Design an enzyme around this catalytic site. Structure first.
Site, PDB file in Angstrom:
ATOM      1  CB  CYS A  65      18.111   5.329 -34.107  1.00  0.00           C
ATOM      2  SG  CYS A  65      19.020   6.091 -32.747  1.00  0.00           S
ATOM      3  NE  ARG A  68      19.471   1.608 -35.117  1.00  0.00           N
ATOM      4  CZ  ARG A  68      19.362   0.753 -36.121  1.00  0.00           C
ATOM      5  NH1 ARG A  68      18.808  -0.440 -35.930  1.00  0.00           N
ATOM      6  NH2 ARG A  68      19.830   1.080 -37.311  1.00  0.00           N
ATOM      7  CD1 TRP A 237      24.213  12.205 -27.767  1.00  0.00           C
ATOM      8  CD2 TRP A 237      23.828  11.142 -25.840  1.00  0.00           C
ATOM      9  NE1 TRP A 237      24.838  10.979 -27.833  1.00  0.00           N
ATOM     10  CE2 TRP A 237      24.610  10.309 -26.660  1.00  0.00           C
ATOM     11  CE3 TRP A 237      23.448  10.685 -24.570  1.00  0.00           C
ATOM     12  CZ2 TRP A 237      25.017   9.042 -26.255  1.00  0.00           C
ATOM     13  CZ3 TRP A 237      23.858   9.438 -24.171  1.00  0.00           C
ATOM     14  CH2 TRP A 237      24.637   8.628 -25.009  1.00  0.00           C
ATOM     15  CD  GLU A 242      19.729  14.584 -34.111  1.00  0.00           C
ATOM     16  OE1 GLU A 242      18.514  14.305 -34.196  1.00  0.00           O
ATOM     17  OE2 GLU A 242      20.461  14.240 -33.148  1.00  0.00           O
TER      18      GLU A 242
HETATM   19  C1  HEM Z   1      21.565   8.498 -27.334  1.00  0.00           C
HETATM   20  C2  HEM Z   1      21.573   9.525 -28.193  1.00  0.00           C
HETATM   21  C3  HEM Z   1      20.926   9.421 -29.513  1.00  0.00           C
HETATM   22  C4  HEM Z   1      21.401   9.923 -30.681  1.00  0.00           C
HETATM   23  C5  HEM Z   1      22.691  10.681 -30.881  1.00  0.00           C
HETATM   24  C6  HEM Z   1      20.463   9.601 -31.683  1.00  0.00           C
HETATM   25  C7  HEM Z   1      20.641   9.979 -33.009  1.00  0.00           C
HETATM   26  C8  HEM Z   1      19.577   9.970 -33.893  1.00  0.00           C
HETATM   27  C9  HEM Z   1      19.513  10.736 -35.080  1.00  0.00           C
HETATM   28  C10 HEM Z   1      20.590  11.682 -35.544  1.00  0.00           C
HETATM   29  C11 HEM Z   1      18.336  10.451 -35.687  1.00  0.00           C
HETATM   30  C12 HEM Z   1      17.755  11.017 -36.955  1.00  0.00           C
HETATM   31  C13 HEM Z   1      18.586  10.724 -38.194  1.00  0.00           C
HETATM   32  C14 HEM Z   1      18.503  11.917 -39.107  1.00  0.00           C
HETATM   33  O1  HEM Z   1      18.442  13.071 -38.611  1.00  0.00           O
HETATM   34  O2  HEM Z   1      18.508  11.748 -40.355  1.00  0.00           O
HETATM   35  C15 HEM Z   1      17.666   9.523 -34.869  1.00  0.00           C
HETATM   36  C16 HEM Z   1      16.440   9.023 -35.223  1.00  0.00           C
HETATM   37  C17 HEM Z   1      15.762   8.223 -34.328  1.00  0.00           C
HETATM   38  N1  HEM Z   1      16.155   7.831 -33.107  1.00  0.00           N
HETATM   39 FE1  HEM Z   1      17.790   8.158 -32.219  1.00  0.00          FE
HETATM   40  N2  HEM Z   1      19.421   8.948 -31.160  1.00  0.00           N
HETATM   41  C18 HEM Z   1      19.638   8.770 -29.848  1.00  0.00           C
HETATM   42  C19 HEM Z   1      18.819   8.163 -28.897  1.00  0.00           C
HETATM   43  C20 HEM Z   1      17.601   7.560 -29.194  1.00  0.00           C
HETATM   44  C21 HEM Z   1      16.740   6.949 -28.271  1.00  0.00           C
HETATM   45  C22 HEM Z   1      17.014   6.921 -26.796  1.00  0.00           C
HETATM   46  C23 HEM Z   1      15.664   6.414 -28.972  1.00  0.00           C
HETATM   47  C24 HEM Z   1      14.476   5.695 -28.466  1.00  0.00           C
HETATM   48  C25 HEM Z   1      14.433   5.025 -27.313  1.00  0.00           C
HETATM   49  C26 HEM Z   1      15.889   6.744 -30.344  1.00  0.00           C
HETATM   50  C27 HEM Z   1      15.071   6.408 -31.388  1.00  0.00           C
HETATM   51  C28 HEM Z   1      15.164   7.054 -32.620  1.00  0.00           C
HETATM   52  C29 HEM Z   1      14.057   6.963 -33.577  1.00  0.00           C
HETATM   53  C30 HEM Z   1      12.756   6.208 -33.413  1.00  0.00           C
HETATM   54  C31 HEM Z   1      14.427   7.687 -34.646  1.00  0.00           C
HETATM   55  C32 HEM Z   1      13.609   7.898 -35.899  1.00  0.00           C
HETATM   56  C33 HEM Z   1      12.495   8.937 -35.691  1.00  0.00           C
HETATM   57  C34 HEM Z   1      11.681   9.131 -36.956  1.00  0.00           C
HETATM   58  O3  HEM Z   1      11.537   8.207 -37.790  1.00  0.00           O
HETATM   59  O4  HEM Z   1      11.129  10.227 -37.185  1.00  0.00           O
HETATM   60  N3  HEM Z   1      17.081   7.403 -30.432  1.00  0.00           N
HETATM   61  N4  HEM Z   1      18.442   9.215 -33.782  1.00  0.00           N
HETATM   62  C1  LIG Z   2      15.561  10.533 -29.556  1.00  0.00           C
HETATM   63  C2  LIG Z   2      16.246  11.231 -30.546  1.00  0.00           C
HETATM   64  C3  LIG Z   2      17.534  11.704 -30.284  1.00  0.00           C
HETATM   65  C4  LIG Z   2      18.195  12.416 -31.291  1.00  0.00           C
HETATM   66  N1  LIG Z   2      19.434  12.915 -31.130  1.00  0.00           N
HETATM   67  N2  LIG Z   2      17.592  12.613 -32.458  1.00  0.00           N
HETATM   68  C5  LIG Z   2      16.355  12.188 -32.756  1.00  0.00           C
HETATM   69  C6  LIG Z   2      15.884  12.473 -34.068  1.00  0.00           C
HETATM   70  C7  LIG Z   2      14.448  12.987 -34.162  1.00  0.00           C
HETATM   71  C8  LIG Z   2      14.039  13.248 -35.508  1.00  0.00           C
HETATM   72  C9  LIG Z   2      12.676  13.209 -35.785  1.00  0.00           C
HETATM   73  C10 LIG Z   2      12.174  13.468 -37.051  1.00  0.00           C
HETATM   74  C11 LIG Z   2      10.712  13.402 -37.254  1.00  0.00           C
HETATM   75  N3  LIG Z   2       9.508  13.347 -37.401  1.00  0.00           N
HETATM   76  C12 LIG Z   2      13.053  13.785 -38.087  1.00  0.00           C
HETATM   77  C13 LIG Z   2      14.432  13.810 -37.851  1.00  0.00           C
HETATM   78  N4  LIG Z   2      15.298  14.108 -38.836  1.00  0.00           N
HETATM   79  C14 LIG Z   2      14.958  14.390 -40.261  1.00  0.00           C
HETATM   80  C15 LIG Z   2      15.789  13.314 -41.006  1.00  0.00           C
HETATM   81  C16 LIG Z   2      15.743  13.242 -42.409  1.00  0.00           C
HETATM   82  C17 LIG Z   2      14.885  14.001 -43.191  1.00  0.00           C
HETATM   83  C18 LIG Z   2      14.903  13.861 -44.572  1.00  0.00           C
HETATM   84  C19 LIG Z   2      15.771  12.962 -45.181  1.00  0.00           C
HETATM   85  C20 LIG Z   2      16.625  12.207 -44.391  1.00  0.00           C
HETATM   86  N5  LIG Z   2      16.587  12.376 -42.999  1.00  0.00           N
HETATM   87  C21 LIG Z   2      14.916  13.580 -36.558  1.00  0.00           C
HETATM   88  C22 LIG Z   2      15.647  11.471 -31.790  1.00  0.00           C
END
Ligand code: HEM
Ligand SMILES: Cc1cc(N)nc(CCc2cc(C#N)cc(NCCc3ccccn3)c2)c1
Ligand code: HEM
Ligand SMILES: Cc1cc(N)nc(CCc2cc(C#N)cc(NCCc3ccccn3)c2)c1
Lengths: 362, 362
Positions: A65, A68, A237, A242
């Site tokens: 994330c 954070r 948000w 994304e």
């Molecule tokens: C406040 C706005 C937030 C933004 C902009 C944000 C941004 C992101 C992004 C962009 C990713 C995925 C990274 C990618 O696409 O490669 C991500 C993953 C994640 N975020 Fe956040 N996030 C936010 C809030 C939160 C909140 C509130 C939580 C939990 C309480 C959270 C927990 C996670 C988790 C667990 C992942 C990984 C999910 C997975 O492994 O599939 N995020 N976040």
């Molecule tokens: C709470 C929350 C807020 C936010 N703005 N984005 C997320 C992300 C959710 C998410 C869930 C899963 C899921 N399951 C996969 C991705 N992204 C794909 C990321 C990726 C894919 C491949 C290589 C590197 N990065 C993102 C979660």
């Protein structure tokens, strides 16, 4: 064994939690109470403070994330009291409403009763509370291919999508004791959607793209102190990439780049023209502009990365080890323009945390 | 011990090498000869075939290299015969000439005598045979900041750069027995440079950007069968992003994005405008166009990724384990538009391979 696992996790969590809360002196008595409670019931119940801080720590520990920095301002809704599917439904409706907050998105988590003996009280099927359905029938692709299997499971249960590219999936969850999940159509007034337009290119609306305002992950397990909250939907948000670089752009998702390239007036013929890269940028500019224009919270990946840098500085200033998954923290566009790209992160798993769990469908 | 390390590496390499070469029956006798040679001399000498195939395998095993599809066509120049600094110099001049090949770049490696007892015969100081100097004096930044330390070491040795942003560093290397390296100015006729212009935006030439045609890594150690070729410069052609997204764009390199944004007529004021992303794309379009226009080999990252996919398919069809460093294989722009981004790679180190070694300066 399962009790000992529980106990060790509890000890580690309570100590850490109360230390951060400044309740270090209360650790001893709370640990005794928990010990006794585990001995008698095979489990223990988090106080509201422990639960709230647990969810926040879990966010803080989420290696993937980038958002954070704001971990401590997570709005934690304690719904461990729900027993019925109407209460679950209403709690999910409420989460969407309060999280959306008229576009001024509040990072929120709703926490449902935890697994007991690995027995779920509530099993949410949705990957996100708000997501578009996907269909694939004899070459015909409609909607979000990522939602195809859940969509098919929903349609097994008597739901029928209109088969637009943007059908909202219903909420679908199962209660302990029920063989089948139930589904409820999302009230449209709760779901904010954003039409995607471009600030300078008017033809962009011809694509008729849109996306929903709030990503609400509803299929992960929150683990806090050895307690498994398998049902604990949370949202932030969006970071624009994304939507613009993955949801709308991926070939296995909406796959819009060729259409984007066409409306922005560039050929999509030669790799050396970097038309995909150019389409990606305009699409991503469109997404940020569109969300901002509508008053829906969004962050661009540069700002997000700057905020994450502050999270790193905050972590070090607090003496906390920082963990991160470089492969998810780097944005899918211009990653080398962020500081994240140019350093490394320890991808160790620290608890509390959010975890994947097996899908109940497929 | 060092002999046993040598022997084990030799056994493993010779077996694998001859297997691929179809010389499986010759392994036994060659191993005996090597055994005896190690016993007597503390080392062994690669046949030309082993050396050539060793260098190719090393490329094939380079986890971070997206260009590996063409591993088998590496041009291997065997210069283990050089004894003098003029021969080294001339071998380096020749490498540049034959690699450049009038713009039709030939992936080439020149292999110098290997370390003996960890004693280098030839110690090359250059990071690349062709690279620009960098200066930093009282706030004043000129040239490539990445070359600052080597530039300073060069100027210790009586070389003086003209202090343009694009001074070619001299070749600098030390011979066994000499306390000081020697340097030789690169003949300009050997070094192809490409002015960076944009296909559609004429003002782009106002930036007066250029880059050199051929990246020739000269500071890594080639290890083959326990033999350490610390001096074995190799080159490919560039993937455009290396120039456009890193060398010219990085804040710690030439840092041109704001200037790019200005000449392409966009504001560089708001993160949400994605001006950096947009500048990156135009800069990268400019680089590809410019190299192509000049007849200098270059590959765009999409084509490179497509070629790498074929390398993966080739590896599996050959029953070879594929290794890769996801963090280097993904391009620094639009990584999610490549297949690389959407899979994982085993980052195991297989030998033969190229390795970092300590800089002799700094
Ligand atoms: C406040 C706005 C937030 C933004 C902009 C944000 C941004 C992101 C992004 C962009 C990713 C995925 C990274 C990618 O696409 O490669 C991500 C993953 C994640 N975020 Fe956040 N996030 C936010 C809030 C939160 C909140 C509130 C939580 C939990 C309480 C959270 C927990 C996670 C988790 C667990 C992942 C990984 C999910 C997975 O492994 O599939 N995020 N976040
Ligand atoms: C709470 C929350 C807020 C936010 N703005 N984005 C997320 C992300 C959710 C998410 C869930 C899963 C899921 N399951 C996969 C991705 N992204 C794909 C990321 C990726 C894919 C491949 C290589 C590197 N990065 C993102 C979660
Ligand atoms: C033929 C054209 C070639 C192309 C387009 C190419 C492409 C690349 C790129 C883009 C990288 C760095 C990845 C990044 O920037 O994140 C790289 C790394 C590397 N390439 Fe290649 N390459 C080519 C030829 C070669 C050759 C001929 C060799 C050796 C014989 C080689 C060995 C390597 C090695 C060792 C690295 C990693 C260097 C390090 O760890 O610092 N490549 N390649
Ligand atoms: C033979 C050859 C050909 C070619 N076209 N490129 C290279 C690449 C040389 C290279 C050498 C070093 C070196 N030393 C670093 C990088 N790139 C930085 C990559 C990076 C940095 C940070 C995070 C992820 N990736 C690239 C080598």
């Amino acid at each position: 064994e399962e009790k000992e696992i529980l106990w060790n996790e509890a000890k580690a969590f309570i100590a850490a939690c109360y230390q951060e809360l400044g309740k270090a002196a209360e650790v001893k008595d709370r640990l005794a109470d928990i010990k006794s409670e585990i001995d008698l019931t095979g489990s223990y119940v988090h106080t509201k403070e422990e639960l709230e801080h647990g969810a926040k720590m879990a966010w803080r520990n989420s290696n993937r994330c980038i958002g954070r920095l704001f971990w401590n301002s997570l709005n934690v809704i304690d719904r461990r009291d729900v027993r019925t599917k109407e209460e679950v439904r209403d709690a999910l409706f409420h989460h969407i409403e309060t999280a959306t907050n008229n576009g001024k998105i509040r990072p929120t988590i709703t926490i449902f009763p935890p697994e007991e003996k690995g027995e779920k009280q509530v099993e949410i099927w949705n990957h996100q509370l708000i997501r578009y359905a996907g269909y694939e029938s004899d070459g015909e692709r409609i909607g979000d291919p990522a939602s195809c299997s859940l969509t098919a499971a929903c349609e097994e249960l008597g739901w029928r999508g209109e088969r637009t590219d943007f059908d909202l999936l219903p909420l679908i969850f199962r209660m302990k004791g029920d063989e089948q999940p139930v589904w409820y159509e999302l009230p449209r007034s709760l779901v904010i959607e954003v039409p995607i337009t471009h600030p300078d290119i008017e033809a962009f609306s011809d694509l008729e793209l849109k996306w929903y305002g709030v990503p609400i992950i509803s299929d992960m397990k929150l683990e806090v102190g050895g307690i498994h909250y398998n049902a604990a939907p949370f949202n932030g948000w969006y970071m624009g990439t994304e939507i613009g670089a993955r949801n709308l752009a991926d070939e296995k998702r909406y796959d819009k780049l060729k259409k984007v390239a066409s409306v922005i007036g560039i050929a999509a013929d030669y790799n050396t023209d970097l038309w995909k890269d150019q389409a990606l940028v305009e699409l991503n500019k469109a997404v940020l502009h569109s969300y901002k224009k509508q008053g829906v919270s969004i962050v661009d990946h540069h700002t997000a990365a700057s905020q994450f840098k502050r999270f790193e500085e905050q972590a070090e200033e607090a003496g906390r080890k920082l963990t991160g998954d470089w492969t998810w923290l780097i944005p899918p566009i211009s990653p080398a323009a962020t500081h994240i790209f140019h350093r490394s992160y320890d991808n160790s798993i620290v608890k509390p945390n959010y975890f994947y769990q097996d899908k109940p469908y497929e």
